[PDB]
PDB file of C-alpha atoms and ligand atoms in Angstrom:
ATOM      1  CA  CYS A   1     -16.232  77.629  74.549  1.00 47.40           C
ATOM      2  CA  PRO A   2     -19.851  76.779  74.276  1.00 49.97           C
ATOM      3  CA  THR A   3     -22.343  79.181  75.668  1.00 49.40           C
ATOM      4  CA  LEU A   4     -25.714  78.841  77.639  1.00 46.92           C
ATOM      5  CA  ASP A   5     -29.156  79.345  76.209  1.00 48.12           C
ATOM      6  CA  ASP A   6     -30.585  82.888  76.353  1.00 48.52           C
ATOM      7  CA  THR A   7     -33.152  81.633  78.861  1.00 49.77           C
ATOM      8  CA  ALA A   8     -30.932  79.547  81.121  1.00 46.81           C
ATOM      9  CA  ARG A   9     -32.219  79.996  84.629  1.00 42.11           C
ATOM     10  CA  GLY A  10     -32.591  78.302  87.860  1.00 42.73           C
ATOM     11  CA  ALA A  11     -30.247  76.181  90.035  1.00 42.33           C
ATOM     12  CA  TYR A  12     -29.318  72.577  89.274  1.00 42.34           C
ATOM     13  CA  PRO A  13     -30.392  70.390  92.102  1.00 43.64           C
ATOM     14  CA  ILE A  14     -28.081  67.630  93.477  1.00 42.48           C
ATOM     15  CA  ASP A  15     -29.807  64.645  94.861  1.00 41.02           C
ATOM     16  CA  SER A  16     -27.799  63.251  97.711  1.00 39.97           C
ATOM     17  CA  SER A  17     -28.891  59.605  96.750  1.00 39.72           C
ATOM     18  CA  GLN A  18     -27.284  59.983  93.405  1.00 35.92           C
ATOM     19  CA  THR A  19     -23.681  60.433  92.155  1.00 36.07           C
ATOM     20  CA  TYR A  20     -22.774  63.049  89.456  1.00 31.84           C
ATOM     21  CA  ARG A  21     -19.969  63.958  87.150  1.00 30.83           C
ATOM     22  CA  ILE A  22     -18.641  66.862  85.087  1.00 31.76           C
ATOM     23  CA  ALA A  23     -19.257  65.528  81.505  1.00 31.61           C
ATOM     24  CA  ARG A  24     -17.488  68.417  79.752  1.00 33.05           C
ATOM     25  CA  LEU A  25     -15.393  71.473  81.030  1.00 31.11           C
ATOM     26  CA  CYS A  26     -14.054  74.095  78.582  1.00 30.00           C
ATOM     27  CA  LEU A  27     -11.600  76.792  79.626  1.00 31.04           C
ATOM     28  CA  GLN A  28     -11.131  79.687  77.194  1.00 27.37           C
ATOM     29  CA  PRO A  29      -8.412  82.011  78.316  1.00 26.76           C
ATOM     30  CA  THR A  30      -8.993  85.720  78.050  1.00 27.67           C
ATOM     31  CA  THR A  31      -5.805  86.673  79.991  1.00 28.36           C
ATOM     32  CA  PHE A  32      -2.198  85.586  80.279  1.00 27.57           C
ATOM     33  CA  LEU A  33      -0.099  87.477  82.820  1.00 26.10           C
ATOM     34  CA  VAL A  34       3.555  87.164  83.413  1.00 28.44           C
ATOM     35  CA  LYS A  35       5.415  88.138  86.548  1.00 27.56           C
ATOM     36  CA  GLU A  36       8.041  90.975  85.752  1.00 28.58           C
ATOM     37  CA  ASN A  37       9.667  93.110  88.453  1.00 28.99           C
ATOM     38  CA  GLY A  38       7.333  91.158  90.873  1.00 26.69           C
ATOM     39  CA  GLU A  39       4.074  92.248  89.158  1.00 26.97           C
ATOM     40  CA  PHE A  40       1.790  90.052  86.973  1.00 26.26           C
ATOM     41  CA  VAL A  41       1.746  92.094  83.655  1.00 28.73           C
ATOM     42  CA  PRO A  42      -0.486  91.524  80.704  1.00 29.07           C
ATOM     43  CA  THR A  43       0.781  89.931  77.571  1.00 27.09           C
ATOM     44  CA  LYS A  44      -0.653  89.455  73.961  1.00 23.09           C
ATOM     45  CA  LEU A  45      -1.635  85.931  72.995  1.00 24.51           C
ATOM     46  CA  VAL A  46       0.232  85.266  69.755  1.00 27.23           C
ATOM     47  CA  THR A  47      -1.095  81.695  69.089  1.00 27.59           C
ATOM     48  CA  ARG A  48      -3.933  82.150  66.690  1.00 32.25           C
ATOM     49  CA  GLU A  49      -5.261  78.628  66.771  1.00 32.37           C
ATOM     50  CA  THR A  50      -7.514  77.308  69.581  1.00 34.09           C
ATOM     51  CA  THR A  51      -6.098  78.050  72.987  1.00 31.91           C
ATOM     52  CA  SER A  52      -8.907  76.485  74.992  1.00 29.24           C
ATOM     53  CA  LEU A  53      -8.917  73.417  77.161  1.00 30.60           C
ATOM     54  CA  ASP A  54     -11.893  71.321  76.494  1.00 30.57           C
ATOM     55  CA  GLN A  55     -13.552  67.906  76.975  1.00 31.21           C
ATOM     56  CA  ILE A  56     -12.359  67.855  80.653  1.00 31.10           C
ATOM     57  CA  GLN A  57     -14.408  65.444  82.761  1.00 30.98           C
ATOM     58  CA  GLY A  58     -14.476  63.299  85.850  1.00 28.30           C
ATOM     59  CA  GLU A  59     -16.303  62.309  88.915  1.00 27.45           C
ATOM     60  CA  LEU A  60     -17.834  64.624  91.382  1.00 26.88           C
ATOM     61  CA  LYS A  61     -17.143  62.934  94.807  1.00 23.23           C
ATOM     62  CA  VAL A  62     -19.186  63.689  97.862  1.00 22.54           C
ATOM     63  CA  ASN A  63     -17.352  64.449 100.895  1.00 23.04           C
ATOM     64  CA  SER A  64     -18.363  64.077 104.662  1.00 21.87           C
ATOM     65  CA  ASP A  65     -19.280  67.729 104.837  1.00 23.11           C
ATOM     66  CA  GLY A  66     -21.519  67.589 101.687  1.00 23.04           C
ATOM     67  CA  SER A  67     -19.048  69.542  99.468  1.00 24.99           C
ATOM     68  CA  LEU A  68     -18.436  68.145  96.014  1.00 24.11           C
ATOM     69  CA  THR A  69     -14.814  67.299  94.749  1.00 22.37           C
ATOM     70  CA  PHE A  70     -14.325  67.343  91.028  1.00 21.70           C
ATOM     71  CA  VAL A  71     -11.553  64.725  90.165  1.00 23.97           C
ATOM     72  CA  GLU A  72     -10.344  65.396  86.556  1.00 25.61           C
ATOM     73  CA  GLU A  73      -9.955  62.004  84.834  1.00 24.59           C
ATOM     74  CA  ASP A  74      -9.804  62.912  81.139  1.00 27.22           C
ATOM     75  CA  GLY A  75      -9.760  65.752  78.547  1.00 29.42           C
ATOM     76  CA  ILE A  76      -7.759  68.049  76.462  1.00 30.94           C
ATOM     77  CA  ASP A  77      -6.231  69.526  79.560  1.00 31.42           C
ATOM     78  CA  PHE A  78      -2.895  70.744  78.227  1.00 33.19           C
ATOM     79  CA  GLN A  79      -2.344  73.350  75.508  1.00 38.37           C
ATOM     80  CA  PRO A  80       1.062  74.968  74.507  1.00 38.84           C
ATOM     81  CA  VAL A  81       0.625  78.863  73.923  1.00 37.37           C
ATOM     82  CA  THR A  82       2.838  81.516  72.918  1.00 38.15           C
ATOM     83  CA  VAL A  83       2.455  85.104  74.316  1.00 41.53           C
ATOM     84  CA  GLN A  84       4.222  88.254  73.490  1.00 42.21           C
ATOM     85  CA  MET A  85       5.443  90.845  76.078  1.00 41.43           C
ATOM     86  CA  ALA A  86       4.997  94.443  75.440  1.00 39.65           C
ATOM     87  CA  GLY A  87       8.696  94.773  74.704  1.00 38.03           C
ATOM     88  CA  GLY A  88       8.434  91.972  72.060  1.00 36.95           C
ATOM     89  CA  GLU A  89       9.688  88.792  73.899  1.00 39.48           C
ATOM     90  CA  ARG A  90       7.768  85.789  72.791  1.00 44.64           C
ATOM     91  CA  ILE A  91       7.298  83.397  75.645  1.00 44.02           C
ATOM     92  CA  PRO A  92       5.992  79.781  75.309  1.00 40.40           C
ATOM     93  CA  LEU A  93       3.615  78.955  78.197  1.00 39.63           C
ATOM     94  CA  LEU A  94       1.886  75.713  79.214  1.00 38.21           C
ATOM     95  CA  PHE A  95      -1.814  76.251  79.820  1.00 39.25           C
ATOM     96  CA  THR A  96      -3.139  73.269  81.771  1.00 36.83           C
ATOM     97  CA  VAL A  97      -5.430  71.820  84.450  1.00 37.66           C
ATOM     98  CA  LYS A  98      -4.106  68.281  84.296  1.00 40.42           C
ATOM     99  CA  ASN A  99      -4.833  66.263  87.490  1.00 39.36           C
ATOM    100  CA  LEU A 100      -7.233  68.946  88.638  1.00 36.19           C
ATOM    101  CA  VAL A 101      -8.878  68.208  92.050  1.00 38.25           C
ATOM    102  CA  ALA A 102     -11.255  70.940  92.996  1.00 39.76           C
ATOM    103  CA  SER A 103     -13.927  71.251  95.711  1.00 38.84           C
ATOM    104  CA  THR A 104     -17.009  73.162  96.215  1.00 43.34           C
ATOM    105  CA  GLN A 105     -18.313  74.789  99.486  1.00 45.93           C
ATOM    106  CA  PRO A 106     -19.944  72.420 102.014  1.00 45.29           C
ATOM    107  CA  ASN A 107     -23.451  70.976 102.108  1.00 45.89           C
ATOM    108  CA  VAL A 108     -24.176  70.913  98.375  1.00 44.48           C
ATOM    109  CA  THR A 109     -27.893  70.905  97.673  1.00 43.90           C
ATOM    110  CA  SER A 110     -27.696  72.429  94.222  1.00 44.37           C
ATOM    111  CA  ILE A 111     -25.248  74.076  91.718  1.00 41.64           C
ATOM    112  CA  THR A 112     -26.053  77.886  91.768  1.00 43.58           C
ATOM    113  CA  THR A 113     -24.438  81.129  90.532  1.00 43.00           C
ATOM    114  CA  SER A 114     -22.796  81.266  93.895  1.00 42.15           C
ATOM    115  CA  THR A 115     -21.057  77.839  93.651  1.00 43.62           C
ATOM    116  CA  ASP A 116     -17.295  78.004  93.470  1.00 44.66           C
ATOM    117  CA  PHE A 117     -14.788  75.218  92.829  1.00 42.98           C
ATOM    118  CA  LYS A 118     -11.324  75.720  94.187  1.00 43.76           C
ATOM    119  CA  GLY A 119      -8.289  73.368  93.911  1.00 42.43           C
ATOM    120  CA  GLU A 120      -4.807  72.409  92.506  1.00 42.95           C
ATOM    121  CA  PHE A 121      -3.457  70.815  89.475  1.00 44.82           C
ATOM    122  CA  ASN A 122      -0.222  69.388  88.330  1.00 42.92           C
ATOM    123  CA  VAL A 123       2.105  71.210  85.707  1.00 39.36           C
ATOM    124  CA  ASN A 124       4.923  69.003  84.962  1.00 38.69           C
ATOM    125  CA  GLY A 125       6.370  68.496  88.387  1.00 35.23           C
ATOM    126  CA  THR A 126       4.823  71.594  90.171  1.00 37.91           C
ATOM    127  CA  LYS A 127       1.478  72.627  91.480  1.00 36.92           C
ATOM    128  CA  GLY A 128      -0.873  75.145  90.125  1.00 36.35           C
ATOM    129  CA  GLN A 129      -3.992  76.698  91.818  1.00 39.36           C
ATOM    130  CA  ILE A 130      -7.297  77.500  90.276  1.00 37.98           C
ATOM    131  CA  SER A 131     -10.744  78.930  91.113  1.00 37.20           C
ATOM    132  CA  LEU A 132     -13.935  78.479  89.155  1.00 35.91           C
ATOM    133  CA  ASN A 133     -16.566  81.044  89.728  1.00 41.10           C
ATOM    134  CA  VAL A 134     -19.943  79.737  88.418  1.00 38.76           C
ATOM    135  CA  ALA A 135     -21.876  82.719  87.070  1.00 33.92           C
ATOM    136  CA  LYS A 136     -24.856  81.180  85.216  1.00 35.14           C
ATOM    137  CA  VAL A 137     -26.672  77.862  85.585  1.00 36.48           C
ATOM    138  CA  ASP A 138     -29.142  76.139  83.330  1.00 35.21           C
ATOM    139  CA  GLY A 139     -31.102  73.851  85.742  1.00 34.50           C
ATOM    140  CA  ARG A 140     -32.769  71.958  82.879  1.00 35.13           C
ATOM    141  CA  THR A 141     -29.716  70.960  80.974  1.00 33.08           C
ATOM    142  CA  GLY A 142     -26.996  70.910  83.749  1.00 33.93           C
ATOM    143  CA  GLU A 143     -24.984  73.507  81.799  1.00 32.90           C
ATOM    144  CA  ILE A 144     -22.961  76.119  83.736  1.00 33.86           C
ATOM    145  CA  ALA A 145     -20.834  78.865  82.883  1.00 34.89           C
ATOM    146  CA  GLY A 146     -18.446  81.259  84.806  1.00 37.50           C
ATOM    147  CA  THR A 147     -14.969  82.692  85.035  1.00 36.17           C
ATOM    148  CA  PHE A 148     -11.669  81.090  86.204  1.00 34.04           C
ATOM    149  CA  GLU A 149      -8.306  82.310  87.497  1.00 34.18           C
ATOM    150  CA  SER A 150      -5.292  80.147  87.861  1.00 34.26           C
ATOM    151  CA  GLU A 151      -1.695  80.497  88.871  1.00 33.81           C
ATOM    152  CA  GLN A 152       1.289  78.427  88.117  1.00 33.35           C
ATOM    153  CA  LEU A 153       4.912  78.171  87.006  1.00 32.73           C
ATOM    154  CA  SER A 154       5.342  77.259  83.260  1.00 30.80           C
ATOM    155  CA  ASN A 155       8.911  77.488  81.649  1.00 29.33           C
ATOM    156  CA  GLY A 156      10.644  79.581  84.471  1.00 30.57           C
ATOM    157  CA  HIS A 157       7.810  82.106  84.585  1.00 31.71           C
ATOM    158  CA  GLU A 158       5.235  82.605  87.202  1.00 30.39           C
ATOM    159  CA  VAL A 159       1.983  82.999  85.302  1.00 29.44           C
ATOM    160  CA  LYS A 160      -1.659  84.013  85.950  1.00 24.82           C
ATOM    161  CA  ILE A 161      -4.181  82.876  83.649  1.00 27.19           C
ATOM    162  CA  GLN A 162      -7.868  84.053  83.616  1.00 28.49           C
ATOM    163  CA  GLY A 163     -10.880  83.552  81.364  1.00 25.82           C
ATOM    164  CA  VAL A 164     -14.236  82.052  80.898  1.00 27.05           C
ATOM    165  CA  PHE A 165     -15.443  78.511  81.280  1.00 28.85           C
ATOM    166  CA  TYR A 166     -18.395  76.270  80.315  1.00 29.78           C
ATOM    167  CA  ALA A 167     -19.357  72.951  81.814  1.00 28.29           C
ATOM    168  CA  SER A 168     -22.100  70.274  81.820  1.00 28.66           C
ATOM    169  CA  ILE A 169     -22.922  68.368  84.914  1.00 27.48           C
ATOM    170  CA  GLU A 170     -25.023  65.146  84.834  1.00 27.55           C
ATOM    171  CA  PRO A 171     -25.899  62.086  86.905  1.00 28.08           C
ATOM    172  CA  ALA A 172     -23.481  59.195  86.660  1.00 27.45           C
TER     173      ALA A 172
HETATM  174 CA1  LIG B 201      -0.338  96.065  89.078  1.00 27.00          CA
HETATM  175 CA1  LIG B 202      -1.298  95.630  90.387  1.00 29.32          CA
HETATM  176 CA1  LIG B 203     -20.603  83.265  91.202  1.00 31.30          CA
END
């Protein structure tokens, strides 16, 4: 995924008289865990081409409590991946955030390094959950970066996926 400038600093103010969007969201997985014996255990990513989701975008709606809700409306939000268990089994997994709806804490006055987005998405007839932890904000450009963790059910396996993300926020 893209990265922020070395000098990225400061919060990104949100003007309540304006509306905003996520123009781009990129998820780069660093971690695929598969449940075995009730434990999420690590696997090796075997797919050597791009495994990121990117170009994800959509409105940021304002709720009555001042939180923002991201409604995913487009993007490369689905990627088939193959991982390999320690014992050698190669499992195809579906990495996705399709139909993501994720909200911040209340009373949004600015996007900061303590902003979180939490919500749910659809994986071919079941729900997944995801948390985005913003870790860095460029207040000048609207670029943000952080880490994510999702849980879902792809191909008869309960799967956790973790990694890094980049996004850009801008007025509508
Ligand atoms: Ca453990
Ligand atoms: Ca453990
Ligand atoms: Ca944070």
